[PDB]
Each structure stands twice: as C-alpha cells, then as structure tokens.
Design a binder for these strands. Structure first.
Length: 801
RNA sequence: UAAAGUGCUUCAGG
C-alpha cells in the first residue's frame, strides 16, 4: 500500500527552459516546538480563535510568551521558534472586546529530519513538519486577509449578477521537492456573495429593478434556494444567523408562540412583535421572513432587517452567464499571469515577515528554473483510399484530405426538429442536410441519402412516442438527429429514451447550428456521429506505440462527480481494442460526496468481461487512470480501489493476476509553467507547447510523479496535468509511462486535438455527466441505480461521445 | 445541444 519509488528520470523529448511558480525556501536545521491549545468554548470560528490567541500573546508577555512571536493554525496548534517556559499544562483566561485557554507541550518538530527526508534517505516525509512550516508561512496573511481553503482573498466591483461577484486573491502552500522545500504561489479568483441588504439580494436574484405585492410560490422557491444556508446579520439592534429556510407566510401573518407575563402563551405575528418590541413598523410586511437558528424556537426575521454577511464564498452552481463572465474576467495569458505572481511575491515580502524571520526562514524571490522536455507527438493513422497519416502540430491536426479509419456508411437516419418551424424552416433543414452529407462524404462517413423521416415536435412529452414510432417503423434505423431551441428539458428525455429505453443512437444539434452551417462544425459533428454508430475515427500509428502494447492491455478511466441530498456518480470506462480507440462505460449512483468508488470491483469485472468478449484476450496489464483525487486521499483511495481491482480479477479467475498500474490524474492544482525563451511561447496566450513534460526539480522527492501539459493553451494560462503513480506492478520507466500518457491524450475522438487528460479519464467524466441527464425526472435508491442503467445494444458503443 | 481550452467547483433572542 506504499507508492513505488521513482524508477528513473525521463530522457525523451526536446529540452525546454521553463520557470515554475515554485520558490525555493531556505529552512534552518533548528528544532521547532509544538504546543496544543484547548479553547473554551470550542467550535468557535478559526477567525475568533486567532483573535483570542492574538490577545493571549499580547497579554501574557510578562509571564509566558516574552519577545518571541508564536504562530497558530486557527484551531489547536501553536508553534514557537524557541521553547516556552512551560513544562506542563497551564490554564488561562482571555477577555475579548471571556475565554478559557490552556496550553500544553506536544513535541519538537525536527527540521533536520525534513532536510534528510528531502535528500531521499527517509522512506516518508514527516507530514507533521511540513504542516508546521505551512502554519508559519500563512500566519501573517491569515490575520490580514480572508482565508478560503489554502487561498486568501480581500475586497478590491466585479459583479456576476444574481447577488454574486468574483474576488481576486492568491493561493499559497508549502511543498516538498528533491533537496529543498518549495513555496507554491499563484493567483486565484472565486465567486462570493455581495455584502448587501437582503432586500437588495432578492431583487438581484428575482430580477427586480426596485423592490417596489407578495411573492408567488415560484419566486419564493427560487429565493429560498438562493439564500438557504447563507449567513445574515441583523441591523435593528449585529449578531449573525444562518438561514434555515424562508417562511411561506408574510411577516404580517407569520406567527410565533410568545409566553406572556403569566405562563400563558399566545401566537404573535412577526410584524406585530417588531412593532411592539422594537418600535419598528415593517416597510415590507407583505414579504416573507427568514427562519434561523432552530425550527423549534421559531425565530423569524423580516428581510429588511437583514444583510448578507460579507465574506461568504459561493458554492452553489453558477448560471451559464455568470460562469461566462467569470471566465472572461479571470482569463490571463501566461506572460501576464507570471507577472501577476511576481507582484504577489513582492507584496508578500516573505523575507520581511516577522513571523517568517522569527523562524529563521527565507524565501527566494525568483521562480524556480526547471528544464522540461517536449515529447514528440504520435502520428495519427486515418483510413480510406489515402490511409493518410496526420502529424499533430502544436497539439492540433485536421482531417483535410483524410477519411475515418473505419468509417460507417449511413443508409437510414431520421431528423426530429424540436425547434419551432418559424425559425427553423424546411429551407434550413434541407440546407443543413445537404451540407452535412457533403461533409460526411469528405470525412469518409458517407450519408448515402436523404433522411427517411422529418417532423417537427415540442413539449418534451413527444420524445418517447416519436421514438417508439421510428424504431418500429424504419428497419435498420441508425441515427436520429435531434434539433433543439437552446437549453431545454427535452435534451434530457432524448438521452433518457435513446440511451436508457429504446437504445437508439441520437445526435442533438442546436437550432442556430442548422440555420448557418460551417464545415468545421459539421465536420466536428461527424466525429461524434461516426463514433456513436460504431466507427473508428482514427488510431495511433500502430508502430511507435510504447512496448506495453506488446501484450493485451486494458486502459481504464475513472472519475466521480459530485452534485451541487442527491447522490454522487461514479463512472469507469475501459478500452475494448488494441488501438486503443473504443471504450465501454460502467456507471453507478452512490453516497453523496463519497470520493471512493464503492462498487468498483463489479464495474471492473463488467469491463474485463466486455474486453474478453471483444478481443478474445484476457488483459495482461491493467492501466488505471483515476481523476478527481486529492493528496489527503491517496492512501484511502489506493487502499480500497487497488484491492477492488484485484478482487475483480480474483472473482473472475482464481489465478488471474494481471499487472496493475494505478495513476492519479490531477488538473486541480496551482503548479504553473512558463517559457523562459519567448520563442517557445505558443499562440496569443503564450503558453508552453503541447507535450511539455517535467519530472524533475518541482516533483516529489522520492515517489513516481510528473507534470505533462498534453494540450495546447488556447486562452488563459495552461494547467499542466499532474500524474502520480500510486502503484505499478508493471515497472514502467519514466519515459514509457509519460509517452504512453501523452499518446492516450491523442485518442480522444470528439476533436482532432491532444486533450488535457488521457481519453479514458476524459470519457469517465462524460459518462458521469451523461448520467446526470438520465437521472432528471419528469428517489427509491433502487430506482436511482435503475434510471442510470443503459440499454443493452448501447452499452457496446460510446453513446457518451 | 459541433468542439477544445481558460476561472471556480463544502445568550429577552422570534
């Protein structure tokens, strides 16, 4: 259950000078002293815990703390550069403007042991000491800013609408590497709720110009969904409350049981209560109240008395417009991002931070220099008369003068237009149809003739009936092209009845994309169609593939998507040929927010069986790309899931023991690489080139991991995918695994570009995403798992493309 | 829903 050591360093590829947003730390060899704090009352927000500790140090200089400057993680851990005049536990009081605070020695954090571990002598890096360093480095900014996870934010207006806005801050964390510790610094931007009166909040969320008329059920529900769980503060007295719900009734009629001077209790309206007790005549008695605290204490607050508390990060899903504006506002070219980080470093001034200097730490001002390697891309073999070989350039190629490897001929297909005939006319349909055939012929997926059926529809209630009709009627029906008028629930039903009921291949298309056609678009559309019908768009040039393909091998991609309770969705896909091109999908509904794939064993078993049925081979090796995992989970994830994979093999055959390689894929980190030489910048965004690989300098000191930017940066700064090998029975060299991983990024069939993660990992995402739409209704557990199960025929092919 | 990439993505009280 221990990750294997780095076997070697890669040598393949053209060298490339890079800078990473990792800054060398000079750490002393001294011993750090760790103390534990028990603060009563407990479960106070880390913020107030810090204020308490702050006043504690200021107040107890005379006796306890002296000249030194302690650091504090906000909870129970206090660290010092030199030992305190403590040898035992000590109890003390703190009055904020009363808290019981005790302090007891825990143990000495050894930085020398860390030095040694970084040189590679010790089997494990003392996580405790790294944590200690992290506490030192972020103690100051923790007092100066609003900490959110490992990031820090402050107030600049960058509105997104709907009561939300995007704040700019920075990420900070201490990381180990070979020889030395590193400080990772990056810009970050995330959504927050604007600090404002709740009355203004309802306006922005319900699209009112001015509050002004009670609320309709529709409005109340939308308002409830938005404010539920948010903190508010009262303006009629300052205390904060968390919103449990929004009353159905208006403040004028909403009541609560108040006990009179005599033991008798009477129902009193919120409005009347605020009139008598607070002398306040509610200006908006017709609006609902916020229910806070306990359901049992009946605490309701008028809207006009509440403000949305400042500093609350938005977690609920953003709208498409909000997401669009945020992406626009946050996109930075690589050169621009590098400069922003240099500014952050300058204003961070770590080398003048009294707490950093207190612990004798020093941080280098310049980014770490690292030599990357630009791996050669694989050739892409197409099929047809030409059998053309496409050579990716800058992570991109095209299909001009090329035809699908194994292109499917379409003799029977139907068009179902759910867009109003007014906008999408017969003229548009036959113009679109004509051009699609034309393009389909160029691509080698010949649409042999006109559609056998074409009708308009609406309501999303006409889907299954029409589909029942098409299947029973037209023999050998291959494809049903569906046309939608923008976002709509019909898409969900189309995929539900298509994938989950009748088992028919469907390809949706926006109304706007049939009105005005483009060769590229229609061409990209053919990529999905040919695949959905069982075709092979292309394959890696058979020769030039890594030696792993010398024996039957299966590639698995796994991911878990969590909703914004509703269950999480686990998806595992497996390759079904030697190219590898075709994948089968397994999917499961599981516990809300559970990271581990509960039913992995059974999912892997299903895939192994499908693989054997397809290839008549039993995999000698299983290559398992796992996306959506964190460092805090590598141990637990590897344990259950590695075992589950083994269990699948055993449950299949007593002595079937293929070599397993377990690789975690991570896009969600703050490692950024920049070209040192301007001439190596690609595109307007000036990013590193596709294929850029780094397995030195900023990587794990002992274990087997590497960064690989497999994709071309289009806009903003590229995120190099990180790959961590948690287990390897197959004893890959660094080069082979890195090349293999890069080539798998070229097998993704939705586009003729190298994508940012291996195809199987990507497909897993698509499968889980598709499951969402399948679960859309109109919760019996057995029914959820059932609304996610796919039709027999469809399971053989990549319906999720 | 042509596509990829880019930002995020847990203690008078009523």
């Amino acid at each position: 259950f221990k990750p294997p050591p780095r076997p070697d360093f890669g040598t393949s590829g053209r060298t490339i000078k890079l800078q990473a947003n990792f800054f060398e730390m000079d750490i002393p060899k001294i011993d750090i002293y760790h103390y534990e704090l028990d603060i009563k009352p407990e479960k106070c927000p880390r913020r107030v815990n810090r204020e308490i500790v702050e006043h504690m140090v200021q107040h107890f200089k005379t006796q306890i703390f002296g000249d030194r400057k302690p650091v504090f993680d906000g909870r129970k851990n206090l660290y010092t550069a030199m030992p305190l005049p403590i040898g035992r536990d000590k109890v003390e009081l703190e009055v904020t403007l009363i808290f019981k605070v005790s302090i007891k020695w825990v143990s000495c954090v050894s930085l020398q042991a860390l030095h040694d571990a970084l040189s590679g002598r010790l089997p494990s890096v003392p996580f405790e000491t790294i944590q200690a360093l992290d506490v030192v480095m972020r103690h100051l900014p923790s007092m100066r800013y609003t900490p959110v996870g490992r990031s820090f934010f402050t107030a600049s207006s960058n509105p997104l609408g709907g009561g939300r806005e995007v704040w700019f801050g920075f990420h900070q964390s201490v990381r180990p590497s070979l020889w030395k510790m590193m400080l990772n610094i990056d810009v970050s931007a995330t959504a927050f709720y604007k600090a404002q009166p709740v009355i203004e909040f309802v306006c922005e969320v319900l699209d009112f110009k001015s509050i002004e008329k009670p609320l309709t059920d529709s409005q109340r529900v939308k308002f409830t969904k938005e404010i539920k769980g948010l903190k508010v503060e009262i303006t009629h007295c300052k205390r904060k409350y968390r919103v449990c719900n929004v009353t159905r009734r208006p403040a004028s009629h909403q009541t609560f049981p108040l006990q009179q001077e005599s033991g008798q209790t009477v129902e009193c309206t919120v409005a009347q209560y605020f009139k008598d007790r607070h002398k306040l005549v509610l200006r908006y008695p017709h609006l609902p109240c916020l229910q806070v605290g306990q359901e049992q204490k009946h605490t309701y607050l008028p809207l006009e008395v509440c403000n949305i508390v400042a500093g609350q990060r938005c977690i609920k899903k953003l709208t498409d417009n909000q997401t669009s504006t945020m992406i626009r506002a946050t996109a930075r070219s690589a050169p621009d991002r590098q400069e922003e980080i240099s500014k952050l470093m300058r204003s961070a001034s770590f080398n003048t931070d009294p707490y950093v200097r207190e612990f004798g730490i020093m941080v280098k001002d310049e980014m770490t220099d690292v030599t990357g390697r630009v791996l050669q891309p694989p050739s892409i073999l197409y099929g047809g008369r030409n059998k053309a070989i496409a050579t990716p350039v800058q992570g991109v190629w095209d299909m001009r003068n090329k035809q699908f490897h194994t292109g499917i001929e379409i003799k029977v297909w139907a068009i179902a237009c759910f867009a109003p005939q007014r906008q999408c006319t017969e003229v548009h349909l036959k113009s679109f149809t004509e051009q699609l055939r034309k393009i389909s012929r160029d691509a080698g997926m010949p649409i042999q003739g006109q559609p056998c059926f074409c009708k308009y529809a609406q309501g999303a209630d006409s889907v299954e009936p029409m589909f029942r009709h098409l299947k029973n009627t037209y023999a050998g029906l291959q494809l049903v092209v569906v046309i939608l008028p923008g976002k709509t629930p019909v898409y969900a039903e189309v995929k539900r009845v298509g994938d989950t009921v009748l088992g028919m291949a469907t390809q949706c298309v926006q109304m706007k994309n049939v009105q005005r056609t483009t060769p590229q678009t229609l061409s990209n559309l053919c990529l999905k169609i040919n695949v959905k019908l069982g075709g092979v768009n292309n394959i890696l040039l058979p020769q030039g593939r890594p030696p792993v393909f010398q024996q039957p091998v299966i590639f698995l991609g796994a991911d878990v998507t969590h909703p914004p309770k509703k269950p999480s969705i686990a998806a595992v896909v497996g390759s079904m040929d030697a190219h590898p091109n075709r994948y089968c999908a397994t999917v499961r509904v599981q516990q809300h927010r559970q990271e581990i794939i509960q039913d992995l064993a059974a999912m892997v078993r299903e895939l192994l069986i499908q693989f054997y049925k397809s290839t008549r081979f039993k995999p000698t090796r299983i290559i398992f790309y796992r996306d959506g995992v964190s460092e805090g989970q590598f141990q637990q994830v590897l344990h259950h899931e590695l075992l589950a994979i083994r269990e699948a093999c055993i449950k299949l055959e007593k002595d079937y023991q293929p070599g397993i390689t377990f690789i975690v894929v991570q896009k969600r980190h703050h490692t950024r690489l920049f070209c040192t030489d301007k001439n190596e910048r690609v595109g307007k965004s000036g990013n590193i080139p596709a294929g850029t690989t780094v397995d030195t300098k900023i990587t794990h000191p002992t274990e087997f991991d590497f960064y690989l930017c497999s994709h071309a940066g289009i806009q903003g700064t590229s995120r190099p995918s990180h790959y961590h090998v948690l287990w390897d029975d197959n004893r890959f060299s660094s080069d082979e695994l890195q090349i293999l991983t890069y080539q798998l990024c070229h097998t993704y069939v939705r586009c003729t570009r190298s994508v940012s993660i291996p195809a199987p990992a990507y497909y897993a995402h698509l499968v889980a995403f598709r499951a969402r739409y399948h679960l859309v209704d109109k919760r019996d557990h057995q029914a959820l798992a059932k609304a996610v199960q796919v039709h027999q025929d469809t399971l053989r092919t990549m319906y999720f493309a």
